[PDB]
Symmetry: D3
Subunit: 311 residues, 6 copies
Amino acid sequence: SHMFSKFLMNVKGVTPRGSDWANRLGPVALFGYGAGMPRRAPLLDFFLQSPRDCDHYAELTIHDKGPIECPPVMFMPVLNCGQMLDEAAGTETPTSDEWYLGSLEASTELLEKGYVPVSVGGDGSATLSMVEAYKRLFPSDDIVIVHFSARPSVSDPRSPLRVLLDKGLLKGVVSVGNRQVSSEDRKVRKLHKMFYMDMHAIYSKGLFCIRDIRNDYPVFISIDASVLDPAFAPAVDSPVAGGLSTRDLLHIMNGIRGPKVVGIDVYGYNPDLDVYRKDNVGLTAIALSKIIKEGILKAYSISTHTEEEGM
Amino acid sequence: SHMFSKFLMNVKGVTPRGSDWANRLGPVALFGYGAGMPRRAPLLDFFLQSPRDCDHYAELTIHDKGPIECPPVMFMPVLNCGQMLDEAAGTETPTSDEWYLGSLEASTELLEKGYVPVSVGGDGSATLSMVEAYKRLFPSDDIVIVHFSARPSVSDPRSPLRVLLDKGLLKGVVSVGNRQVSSEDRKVRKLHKMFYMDMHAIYSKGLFCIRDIRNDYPVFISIDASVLDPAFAPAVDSPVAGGLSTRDLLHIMNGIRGPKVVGIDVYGYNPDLDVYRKDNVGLTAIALSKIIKEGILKAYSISTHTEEEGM
Amino acid sequence: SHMFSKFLMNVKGVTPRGSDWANRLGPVALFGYGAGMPRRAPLLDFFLQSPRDCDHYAELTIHDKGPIECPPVMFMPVLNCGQMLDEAAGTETPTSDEWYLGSLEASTELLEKGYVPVSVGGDGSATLSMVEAYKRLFPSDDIVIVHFSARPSVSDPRSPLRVLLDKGLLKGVVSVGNRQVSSEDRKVRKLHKMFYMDMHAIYSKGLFCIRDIRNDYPVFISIDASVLDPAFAPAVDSPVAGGLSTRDLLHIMNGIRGPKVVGIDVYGYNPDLDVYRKDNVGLTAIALSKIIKEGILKAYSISTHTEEEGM
Amino acid sequence: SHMFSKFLMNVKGVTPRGSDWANRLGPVALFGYGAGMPRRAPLLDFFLQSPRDCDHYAELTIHDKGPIECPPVMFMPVLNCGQMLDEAAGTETPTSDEWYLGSLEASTELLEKGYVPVSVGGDGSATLSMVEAYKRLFPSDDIVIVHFSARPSVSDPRSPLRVLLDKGLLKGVVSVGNRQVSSEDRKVRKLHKMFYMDMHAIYSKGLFCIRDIRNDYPVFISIDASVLDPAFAPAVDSPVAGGLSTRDLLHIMNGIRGPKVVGIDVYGYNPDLDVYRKDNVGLTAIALSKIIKEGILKAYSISTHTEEEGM
Amino acid sequence: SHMFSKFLMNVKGVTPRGSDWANRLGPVALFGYGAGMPRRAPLLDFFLQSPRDCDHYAELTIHDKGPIECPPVMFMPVLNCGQMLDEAAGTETPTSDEWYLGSLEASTELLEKGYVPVSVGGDGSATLSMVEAYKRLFPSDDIVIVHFSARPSVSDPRSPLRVLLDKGLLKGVVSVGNRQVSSEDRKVRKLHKMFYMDMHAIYSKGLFCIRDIRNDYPVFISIDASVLDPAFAPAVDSPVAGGLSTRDLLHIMNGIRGPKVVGIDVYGYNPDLDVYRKDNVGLTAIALSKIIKEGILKAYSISTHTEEEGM
Amino acid sequence: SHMFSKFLMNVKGVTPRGSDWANRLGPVALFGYGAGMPRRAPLLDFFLQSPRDCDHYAELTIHDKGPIECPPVMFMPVLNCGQMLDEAAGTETPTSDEWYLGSLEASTELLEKGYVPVSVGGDGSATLSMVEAYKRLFPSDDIVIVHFSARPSVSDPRSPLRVLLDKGLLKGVVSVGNRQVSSEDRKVRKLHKMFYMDMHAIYSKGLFCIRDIRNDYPVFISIDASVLDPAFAPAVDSPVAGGLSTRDLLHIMNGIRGPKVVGIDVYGYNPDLDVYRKDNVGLTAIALSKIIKEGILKAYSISTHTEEEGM
């Protein structure tokens, strides 16, 4: 699509991962997705103006263009690739497959250039194209996906998560925060042996006794904003009450385990469905901006088990 | 009142509980209450358009008219009796006693037709007329009421809960989520030996160690939306901060114990006091719609203690 | 400043602490602060119209003018000194130092008249002038400050909390609820040996195992509304998601330990940044009104450790 | 029986409860029981030589003969009535009914002389005669018994606890620490509506979330040593592994609630079945001596709910 | 070996699993192992004289000879095959391989006769021969072993657990209660990807938040008595302090998940190393007798996840 | 004394801390104390024959004579200085001051030779002489002592812990596991502002929520075996039931925080008071041997707070 021309032209014009990044995790590339959502996508820009300091005592640094120099000192570089859909490039609206190919190509290039791709916005279709872009490039590596949502979203044959499971690129799937499980959901679950932690199960077992998830396989983090309670993230289609707090999600996200992060998809946010402050700042934009930040931090600090190392 | 004519005409025209429902709990009848609240009551309709799948892996099925056929397979039938107040039946507003008699007659008929009555909306006066409608029909059965509210609401001689305690139809009362207890509240408490779990008490003891309440007596569930924190349910008169989350309420509601559910009253919701999304969907309507659903599920799965049964 | 003339004229016209108050803690004086915030400050008035009953089974009593008579029976008198800035006293806006001197003089007088000063509104600059007003009058007494905020706010040399630490009037500082710690924040922390409990640390250790803080030194409670999650208190500058619930803050506030309360500063609230109900009631005003109440209660019930006393 | 002559002669020669003890709980009378156990009963004497300081910051004071003067200052007087069976009063062994009548008469006299009777040793038959001695004297008062044992011990028609339930002197029964429940046990349980907390139930719910039991009715504490794990109290018939630690029992005992303590029965200890140190001190004697002490303390500090009182 | 002649002659003379046992789990066969331990093995006989009632409200029934009739009513039949080593059959001592072949043949026959084999006593070499006897008969079925011990015991090439991992009959291994991990232990661990839960890890995460282990593969339970603290089970070689209580082990054992139980090995008990009561009853015999009972119960109630089923 | 001649001759003949040990903590010197205890002291020798692997994945290495070479790889060197009292050096028994001077001189030399002194055995008088030996050499450094005991042991003017507090060499004292607090104990406590965590307080707050103690001052660890429950450590004078398990003590010991460890005193063990296995191995010797090992490990891994460091 010509809507992604200016964007993609800049993506494959990015200077690759430096030789000084050798064995260390990262760096992180960031771009704005917008499939299935209104043309106006403020989540990316709202994140770029947000404070740089994370929960854990580190700091994000954002560069529009490289080269991404590797830091010695709690600095975590982020490559802002901007919005995928070029504003004022026409009144046209990209199709589902146009978004697919555009996301597939962008995430492919960023991956084999050493960057960990982080997609922001959209309907979650970026999850499909990103782990596929990873599976094409790394046919040997097995992928496990941690999914945060109010619903399993795998009862639809065309659903991004099921398509991955039907094509069989996924070694395992961990669903977190489900609270609307259908009859077809339970069936698709059992067939693929999905691991799940529903809201009532998480809340009754204690959230403090959920320390980690444990994985040796590369992890893809797919975060639907609907996993959060409508009080924290009301800007979602079909809100389901009794969800995670923003702090709850951050706690569980801190327990993600694995070798490297193959990609991140933060989605489900619609500006037309948000609760706004009197200064017209959306409540969900505030919540997700924090989650995106701690997600980028996670790509720099991901490992296996929670241990007692060093002297 | 003529305002309830079309409604009540349909209620006592309902085909009674089938012979195939014998010993199993249910079914559930549903109707819209609106005493002390504005004429426009959207909570009932908003619930009917909500997803059918519950937290626990079951499914609600809604029928406007019977006969309510008993399922073999995680189906929970619900009889929608519609709004009690017929819209466009006049500009008149029903009185407190007109709402009382209308609710008393409707709940009486539904009860002795085998249905478990669930009232949605109003100011909580439905609680009075429903357990009375149960006590008239079942003089032998003793009633215990689980009450969720920010305030005991028993310091007023005309308060629906105290009237029940003054007439003495109640064996015991469990107040949950109180955080505004007055001097007169403590006195009325001690006289009737009310069991209570204030917010600070619940939160300091741990919410995960609250597994059940235990009861051998038929339970009536009276849910005031004010028990929820204003961040989740702002559509209440005199909001009191430091309340339960929607998930918190769902957890405690799951611990309700007893033989059968005599009735449910979800109230305290006013559309004029809600926090709205940009698409004009109320935050409290979203919260309560989830609670109503898990309440109907509770009427189908209610028992005593939490055990290890079967092979 | 002439803007505080009518206010201050009334403050030093207050009949001092009665001889019947001898060894008991209190009483409590209350006034409205408004530095760094819009001229319209509704938080004070909104609190005065709020319910008087606290979480703990006591009751607030509010008097515009004294004499403050000491109760025998769960009554906690509060002296309402009104708004510091006299409305319609000119179109002028008081300066930072004008607010400082005005707050310094008011809190000084109220302190040596036996009252525990509680400041409501402003940007937190009241924290500086109040513990200074306490240190001037009580040069022997050492002060420890419990600080609730999303950020340490001590990386700025002109920051109210650092100025206290640079002048060295503080024996110790306890920061609670931090989740945006900068590089300069960690450095200023280590130099003064600040005790801190970040959000991720508090949430992972369990909030129920946080029973008290323990102190033998007089405590000043500085409460920034930003410590609360934006879902509960959105009316703050630069909202940081993943914060405390209103109940969370109340629980931690209940654990405050010390001999007496030297003063309270509830701030960070801006009406222009609040999420409003359809009846135009701000969500943050509701949250803070509860916190102010339990703060006044804390000044009447403060002690050391949590014990098993009496028979 | 003539075996109890010297003992009983001293019991009804005890100067009654002083007028200065009016409304305060206590005092406590102590005597040695020995039904169903070997003639040599060292538990009483071993307790009298044990340290006087309790867990809670108080102190036991022991007097062989009165008058028991009421203290102002953490002193808890105990009247040592000595061993019921007079040593070297013959080679005879008292019968079951001889122990019954002897215990019934002794506990009767001590009760109506104002003392709270505490029986040490025996097989638990003292439980029967003591609450009966209380029911004769106080026909109006209702009794609830908290029972600590590895087994319900109510499947036998002649069992001390069932005899009380068959004659119906008991309002309610709370069984704690059961881990050997038979088929007949479940049946007798359901008939009398016994409340029980089995070991697996207690341990899986968390022992820290067991704060109190709550009761408005006078409590009798019957403590079988078999409720303790054999590692702590091996001196019992038919030891059942997987029991409470000594600390576990002390924690649960601290949660006992009620107006007054009607009596205490510590039993199940047999010197022939104990694990001994190299200095020939029994392990169970050490454990029970601590429990007896905190039981006497409980009779002086018993109340309803766990509250926030005083200033 | 001729030492096992009388035993083995009886084992393959056992009437096979009845046709009425079709899809239900069980039944359970029981025999006494004694490799690496003194000739006198009292653990089996001590278990047979122990109470039949379990923690969970069921009951064990023991039959020396069949046919094992299937119960309708909380009855769990156990086939006592007696001691493997025939006492007074000679002064000879069976070799390591003689114990191996004897255990391999016995467990093979019992398995393909429908019985779940439970071995009691020995040094843990029964673990090797039993899951091998299962792997020969069921080549398709994959085996996962839950191992309870103070030490991984896989650093020795001839160790029973490593031999299984070197031959590769094991799909996965879960080590529970380790507290003496060597350098070679960590290496063998990583190579086979063993899942482990050390004592400090279990105790710091909370034992109540350990609800289950989760498995879809048939489970073999290997229980070394050394996993228990020496205070509960001192009768082990090289006791390691800071171990599980008997209740702790029972709690974790209750969380075992899987389709069926392939076998149980309770070992590590030596009568010469036990702490004895004055009546010469061993403390470890008491502890293990309880664990064996709840292990047999586990073979009758084993499933996957901990759910909310039925109506 | 001539009884310590052969020992002390070897102590000041020890080659000092190597230059390769520069900034790293350690190494650790070990010697056997025996004041107030029988001549036969088997605890030291029993520890030297115990397994070398710790709870945390490290390994102890023991050398009778140096030079103590610094390891790169989870090795923790220990210098065994042997028994202070030379066996068969006479029938004489060293006096209290002879033990004092002998311990003072030995610990002094080991300290200024770079070694962290660990004393094993005795009555706890080694605690006095060791932190004094540290205070003489390091007059600038302030000392905080973590004390594990069933009793505060500071009500006696001649008590080792009070003597330190009367001379004022201690900055702060943390008492852990107290359960026998006297009237004089509370008074001496308040005067010196001792921080304490009694058994009932520790157990009711949850042992899992006790993560660390926090200190910036050099820590001395004084461990009385009486802090452990008599079931784990019966070899103490005046056993007090309801104490810590061995695992409990290990958990709390892991939470010790500070710069360096100034010394360790493990005492209170008497072989004449132990519970023995049938092979005559003492139960307390087993428990303490584990604690000594994890104490030496603590001297090598001690730091401040529990953090998230490294990449």
